[PDB]
Design a protein around this ligand. Structure first.
Ligand code: Y1Z
Length: 127
């Protein structure tokens, strides 16, 4: 029971939207990060059971990962690009909360974060 239920990827009440920016977030931004050598720890919810991290969810109360973001984009869960960007941002800050500066996982997150900022600087004007 160490793992909480994963974040929702669809919700019957939450309104859905599609935009060219959200398409870009899936097809370019998420894809670019997903395929990076350092992606793997970020591709699914942290499994505190498999990784033997019994304190992870004692500390992190707003977990977020790229697997969840990918499904959310595929499901048109977000109203706009900012909601999606917020999830990526939570993902990175979580890592910096839980881990010490200079840990390998943190260096990985930092590299992905840099790339993320490069990609969202090219987010297209909404059409
Ligand atoms: C995200 C996140 N934030 N903190 C962590 C973290 C902190 C301590 C140990 C692991 C993590 C992980 C993490 C999540 C998944 C994985 N893998 C998923 C695929 O199957 C092999 C394991 C890993 N791999 S891992 O080999 O444990 C590892 C990765 C990076 C740096 C150090 C280590 Cl020891 C690491 N992800 N993570």
């Amino acid at each position: 029971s160490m793992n909480p239920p994963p974040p929702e990827t669809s919700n019957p009440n939450k309104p859905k939207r599609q935009t060219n920016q959200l398409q870009y977030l899936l097809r370019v931004v998420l894809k670019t990060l997903w395929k990076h050598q350092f992606a793997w720890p970020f591709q699914q919810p942290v499994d505190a059971v498999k990784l033997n991290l019994p304190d992870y969810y004692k500390i992190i109360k707003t977990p977020m990962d790229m697997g969840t973001i990918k499904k959310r984009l595929e499901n048109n869960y977000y109203w706009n690009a900012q909601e999606c960007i917020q999830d990526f941002n939570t993902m990175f800050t979580n890592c910096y909360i839980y881990n010490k500066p200079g840990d390998d996982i943190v260096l990985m997150a930092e590299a992905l974060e840099k790339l993320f900022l490069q990609k969202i600087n090219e987010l297209p004007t909404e059409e």
